[PDB]
């Protein structure tokens, strides 16, 4: 059993992206006899797909859990659906701001996450971790990778399960926002990391 | 040197109030040679005043830092001003919903906090703790105690410094809110507790 | 040329649903030589489908614009996608709270709106009407009807264009919310109505 | 009977300030036999005080209702209190960003509005206009003028009644915000104007 967890590099002016640390922290760990691989993806259209594809083919994970930062969200959110579209509100890290364009021409308009999202949410709640099911992962890079991963599953037969989890800003990221006007919600790095670990455990247990 | 820190009991249907734990956790500790006293106040108009007054006269603190829960706020907030008015949006723990009534008839319309609020905010930020200055502590029990404490200072000469700090919900309090409709912001109990400790340290250092 | 505009009856405790009035106000009007039909749908799973299907077969509209109330949203929102799933956060008007269930078993996971959403948003902006593209119409009755309408189009060949528009609460609906805790955004009934009229005009102009 | 209504010029990058139009629209009108004067104030510390003082001495109004724009607020808000402090989050129109400074050295920490705020809120609600009582008018120019007006009343004996009303952005102001990231609440210009007219009527009726 192999699990692939991905995170993203910093973007949009942020000095850090907590999901990058999550990926690195989870890399190489083992839950039971399952091997976990953690990889960081660039916040760049095209390049992110290349890295994603290469990683999936290299590792051929049974389960893929892609993690991203969701500025403004107050709790852990588990994505229900990936949409075949790109409409960036801001440009990617290379200045590309793609609008009204499919991710995979001719492919399904959308794919439902194949992670046991309701069971994951339930377990997180039992752990005292606020979490909810999100019905839109946006149309930026998080949705982009979520869709490509699910399309890979539908087209290649692996990973068996694929999904996306968004985490709020961690506290330290709020500091310089205070003087700028508003104070967005945050969640400790420790809780975000544990949330992803829990999702992996629940997904694994689901695979018989 | 004596410091009085207060918190509140649960209210509004909540099973817990993190400030109650903060008060109990800080009771009896010492910062340098300063003695810290932690006391819990009832969320009841009148009774809260009685307890507050008795406590202040009993301990005669040099510094008073009153802490309360602020549902919905995303970061630590330091109150700038206490207003001479009661206008409860919800009733207190004994069903009393007082509206348009002064806290102390004839007394000043308001009192500015005498805690070094800007220095406290600055130190919290250096500690990676999101915090901002609030310009309204509401017109419920938090403001009620904040005003009475500052009035006591102006009238009795002690405490020399008095102020109020509001903390967000702690994560576990969000769990049953998720199914109810929305997901309010939260902040770990550990960070909330440390924030209050920092405020005490900064206040103490301020007193020469 | 025939246009069908639908709205919903009150739900979730609300005494009114502004989209019900919109449907009734637009019923029987004509834009150019196009005939507009306005119908109200029940906020009930199953029954809503029956009424929707009967209406579509009865009128056989070239364009279908389904309108709904979106509590909390601050501006007119044009739905980009309908998802093949039902996961009600609250029960429908008959107490049915369906969870994790497809709308049409075996049908596509999702359908993109076929209304010229970007052109509609652009025209609304020129009219000084705040509007944006929403990437999730929820998984309650609005999404339910949006999906069924688009599925009808894909399966029956009509309507040629189908989409969904959500409107904010109108001001009068905010009054009793004020004492309850928070003040959600609102938009005048007149602006919401005009927004729908504009969408119809833009859709019609699009059909050559 | 004379009523003075003031509004502010555009500020913070905005091309317009709806309160400027309100002031101009209400100037010269009469409610019963009461004369209404509408004047626009600059969003500049110091200069605003000069204009305010000159206007008050020139007209010597019985009632003064100062109106301002409150970006982000979702409904009409009636200010309960003016605070003797300046702490600008942004600079004024002349680049002055005053911090931690009293408005009037030695004067009271605060003044309660003398407008019949609860009756005004009640009437607005009866008119279907969402409105609530705000406990902080900020520490920028709105609070600055609110405080100076109330201080003038306490020191000069006129105006007999003085207060402040904040209005949300009007719809057209939201357009260019949409592409910038978030969609703040708005309220029609017509409703904002009527709200101020209602406040004047209620204030006048209050003066016997």
UniProtKB/Swiss-Prot annotation, chains A, B, C, D:
Q: What is any one of the record's Gene Ontology cellular component terms? A: cytosol
User: Which reaction is catalysed here?
Assistant: Release of an N-terminal pyroglutamyl group from a polypeptide, the second amino acid generally not being Pro
Keywords, sorted A to Z: Cytoplasm, Disulfide bond, Hydrolase, Protease, Thiol protease
Active site residues of this protein: 79, 142, 166
Coiled-coil ranges per UniProt = none
GO MF term set: pyroglutamyl-peptidase activity
So which domain of life are we looking at? Answer: Archaea
Q: Which example biological process does GO assign this protein?
A: proteolysis
Subcellular location as annotated: Cytoplasm
EC numbers for this chain: 3.4.19.3
Q: Does the keyword Disulfide bond apply?
A: yes
Xref: Pfam families: Peptidase_C15 (PF01470)
Question: InterPro entries attached here?
Answer: Peptidase_C15, Peptidase_C15-like, Peptidase_C15-like_sf, PGP-I_bact-type, PGPEP1_Cys_AS, PGPEP1_Glu_AS
Q: What class of enzyme is it?
A: hydrolase
Which Gene3D superfamilies does the entry link to?
Answer: Peptidase C15, pyroglutamyl peptidase I-like
Q: Which family does it belong to?
A: Belongs to the peptidase C15 family.
Q: What does this protein do?
A: Removes 5-oxoproline from various penultimate amino acid residues except L-proline.
On assembly, the entry states:
Homotetramer made of two disulfide-linked dimers.
Put simply, this protein is called Pyrrolidone-carboxylate peptidase
What is the source species? Pyrococcus furiosus (strain ATCC 43587 / DSM 3638 / JCM 8422 / Vc1)
Gene name, per UniProt, is: pcp
